[PDB]
Amino acid sequence: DIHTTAGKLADLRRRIEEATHAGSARAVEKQHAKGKLTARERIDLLLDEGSFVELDEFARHRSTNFGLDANRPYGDGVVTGYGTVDGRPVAVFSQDFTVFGGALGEVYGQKIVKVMDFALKTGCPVVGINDSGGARIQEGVASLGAYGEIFRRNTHASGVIPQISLVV
Amino acid sequence: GPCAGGAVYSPAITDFTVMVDQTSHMFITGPDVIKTVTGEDVGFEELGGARTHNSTSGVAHHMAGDEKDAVEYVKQLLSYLPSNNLSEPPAFPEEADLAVTDEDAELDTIVPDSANQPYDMHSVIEHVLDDAEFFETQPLFAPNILTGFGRVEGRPVGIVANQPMQFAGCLDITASEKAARFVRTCDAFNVPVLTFVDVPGFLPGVDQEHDGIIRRGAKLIFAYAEATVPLITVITRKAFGGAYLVMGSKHLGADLNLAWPTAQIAVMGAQGAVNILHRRTIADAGDDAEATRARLIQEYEDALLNPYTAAERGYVDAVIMPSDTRRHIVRGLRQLRTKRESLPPKKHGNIPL
Amino acid sequence: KAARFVRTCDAFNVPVLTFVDVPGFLPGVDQEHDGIIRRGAKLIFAYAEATVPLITVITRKAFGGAYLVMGSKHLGADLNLAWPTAQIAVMGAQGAVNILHRRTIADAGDDAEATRARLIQEYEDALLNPYTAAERGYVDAVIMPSDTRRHIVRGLRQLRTKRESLPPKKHGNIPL
Amino acid sequence: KAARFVRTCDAFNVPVLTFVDVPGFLPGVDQEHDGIIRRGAKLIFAYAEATVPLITVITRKAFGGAYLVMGSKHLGADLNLAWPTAQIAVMGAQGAVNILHRRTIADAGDDAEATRARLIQEYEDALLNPYTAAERGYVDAVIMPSDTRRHIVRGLRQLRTKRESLPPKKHGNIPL
Numbered sequence A: 001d002i003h004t005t006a007g008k009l010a011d012l013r014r015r016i017e018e019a020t021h022a023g024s025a026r027a028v029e030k031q032h033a034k035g036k037l038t039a040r041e042r043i044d045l046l047l048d049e050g051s052f053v054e055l056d057e058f059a060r061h062r063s064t065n066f067g068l069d070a071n072r073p074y075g076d077g078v079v080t081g082y083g084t085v086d087g088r089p090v091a092v093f094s095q096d097f098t099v100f101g102g103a104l105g106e107v108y109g110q111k112i113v114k115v116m117d118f119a120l121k122t123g124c125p126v127v128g129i130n131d132s133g134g135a136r137i138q139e140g141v142a143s144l145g146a147y148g149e150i151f152r153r154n155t156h157a158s159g160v161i162p163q164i165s166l167v168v
Numbered sequence B: 001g002p003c004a005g006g007a008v009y010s011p012a013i014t015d016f017t018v019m020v021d022q023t024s025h026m027f028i029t030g031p032d033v034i035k036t037v038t039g040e041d042v043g044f045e046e047l048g049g050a051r052t053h054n055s056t057s058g059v060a061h062h063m064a065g066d067e068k069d070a071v072e073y074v075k076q077l078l079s080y081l082p083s084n085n086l087s088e089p090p091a092f093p094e095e096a097d098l099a100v101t102d103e104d105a106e107l108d109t110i111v112p113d114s115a116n117q118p119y120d121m122h123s124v125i126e127h128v129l130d131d132a133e134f135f136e137t138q139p140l141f142a143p144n145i146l147t148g149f150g151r152v153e154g155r156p157v158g159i160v161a162n163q164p165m166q167f168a169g170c171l172d173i174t175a176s177e178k179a180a181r182f183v184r185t186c187d188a189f190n191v192p193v194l195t196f197v198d199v200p201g202f203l204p205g206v207d208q209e210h211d212g213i214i215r216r217g218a219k220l221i222f223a224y225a226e227a228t229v230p231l232i233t234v235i236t237r238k239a240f241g242g243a244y245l246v247m248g249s250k251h252l253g254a255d256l257n258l259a260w261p262t263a264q265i266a267v268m269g270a271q272g273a274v275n276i277l278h279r280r281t282i283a284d285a286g287d288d289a290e291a292t293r294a295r296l297i298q299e300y301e302d303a304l305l306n307p308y309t310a311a312e313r314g315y316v317d318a319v320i321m322p323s324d325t326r327r328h329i330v331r332g333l334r335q336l337r338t339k340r341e342s343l344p345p346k347k348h349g350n351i352p353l
Numbered sequence C, D: 001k002a003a004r005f006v007r008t009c010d011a012f013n014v015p016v017l018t019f020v021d022v023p024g025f026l027p028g029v030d031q032e033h034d035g036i037i038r039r040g041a042k043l044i045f046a047y048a049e050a051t052v053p054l055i056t057v058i059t060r061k062a063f064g065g066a067y068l069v070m071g072s073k074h075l076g077a078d079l080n081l082a083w084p085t086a087q088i089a090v091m092g093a094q095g096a097v098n099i100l101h102r103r104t105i106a107d108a109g110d111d112a113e114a115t116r117a118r119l120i121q122e123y124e125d126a127l128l129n130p131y132t133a134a135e136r137g138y139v140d141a142v143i144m145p146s147d148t149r150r151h152i153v154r155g156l157r158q159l160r161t162k163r164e165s166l167p168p169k170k171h172g173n174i175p176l
């Protein structure tokens, strides 16, 4: 049932459940109590119902600084992918405040490159949903280097494909 | 008919050659010559007859039973292609119904429990395409890899796949050349390429490494990395070592890289990993040597012979339930179809010959 | 000041040499009201835009967003150098250990500021250097400051035939 | 071997100098099985593709498809030279007179091989030279072999400013 094709389908239903609920069930309750929505609930209300195609849903960090490798949430504290708004293509990231306060790290930076580079490639808008405490301090300079590679591909895009930031 | 002498190097340049059993022959040098040169005695049919070009040489694409067929195959080939490399391949757009059929579901099974049991990749293809229609090229040549055309939403798409049934789906000089110059064709015409991945590696032997695998296996890597046109990959089962890279990996520029739960994506097979890792923990106490080693094998295969590492580090966009594949490839090649990507200025590349 | 100068010397094909010694952005409620956020962006946008050879040398302090600004490799600077006295970190030790110790400092206020001054020394000793940035190839080399004039020469010699462009556009949309 | 070398020196703008002495393709059932037809094409495809100055000199033997391969004028070679001892023909005399005599040889086997050896001499005397190719301007000149180093110099001097391109394409589709 694991060594068996069926078992390995019923594994990837388990890790889909764990991935979509990365953030703990007090952290989500705290977010609601602050009148905020959760990053997924944001993505739905943007994109045309059913379009979503989530990329790097099973991403995980690779930092073992300051015992940050005690937990490696799937997604690494951002929800990224592609779909349609009003039946027109558009690539989206939604930072997850539930996960590590939503602090940016290396992986959860390199996801918001992958989306960018997919927009630039295809020629489609990027709608960036923002909700983060700041830099993931555990990952030191790493989580600066991620910011930089975003801020290079915000400039490269600039005037080419519309970039809209939704600060929440 | 006959195509003899230098002539043959016209049809060679040309994208696709169609040849009709028992009544069409190609040869640079006639049997007469090669007798009184090389003392060898050979008929026309064997020398260069349809079958012999289709299966052996890797020169022809198709061998039709009769002319009428052959003409029909040629009209089929045109169907998939644009008139010239400034237009995109003729479409009859349909919008596909992406609720999970009972065809779809069948995918969720058709990878057997035993790694070794084979299963026809021709299915996994025909699952995804329009009307389950696959128009295969070069069937008789390098069966261990499958190339051809169909449609997704009424739009042409090119298909490259490893075919477990043959050689286990291992890549070999012949499959790497057959696939390489299919991809390049699809790319130059702007037709998209969909790649299905089962591959345990490259089929060992001394021959292979004399003939020049090194150069002639490279071909396929070059073709993928060169390609602009939409590239969607799906790993069903096995993806080891370089032969993972080769098969339309992300590292070469493939847009969207899916992997089924069954996928195994790892430097090398677990016995031939456990070896090199544990060669001083399997040396200690020759007593119960194997008992450990086939332990450390059965931990390797449970730890690393799965999609999930290559997921964590975004080498495969998504691990997906095999049912879902004809949704992903749909709503992938929607986005893609405005892919815009190019390779540095240059009169031509320098791909290995 | 620096944004418009970088642009100028990237429009008229003049190589830019940076030198880096920046603790961070000036803290004030004026700076924020008067749009730092838009008007500090300009510098990042100039760096990333520019396609004439960029060579950066961090002399001393390079923390957080300011490190990124100052002709960092992330924004497509060619050759990034650092002296031994470069400190390249998310943010000052004090601020760092306030967030990544907060607990074991709140523990036993008996010796709070104390254990926290120790922790500040530790974090400075561990990460207040160019040796993690080095490891990850954010700075090409760590150099002996005397060797800053050689690297700049040899680097520009190579760099002159740099070919680099930004995707087709009528113009960018930089912060105003 | 030769295809990939020609490409290399046509990608990096290096002129190619050919020398031609080729009876034809190796006859075997291996060569054909192992895809001569695709893998001999590569050379023709490299020649015709290449847009850096091409200068060819036929020293001796140049028959059939092999003549075409070897940097012939048909595949867009600039300046084609031939020495007096160049033989440029569809195919060896013997093979030629076997097909374009077949009758008057089958006549009277009394002196078959004989009249056929004579015919072989004739056809060699008539067409086994560079004088029909000359007539039709397939080879610019017939030269005295000593004058092969002058023509190559003077020819390259001119040829250097050669401008030539192939129709717009992402890439070709050469035989693999």
Ligand SMILES: O=C(O)CCCC[C@@H]1SC[C@@H]2NC(=O)N[C@@H]21
Pocket: B001, B002, B004, B022, B023, B025, B044, B045
């Ligand atoms: O079926 C046959 O006739 C024999 C097989 C090969 C025939 C050779 S190919 C060149 C030559 N031209 C022809 O029309 N027949 C022979």
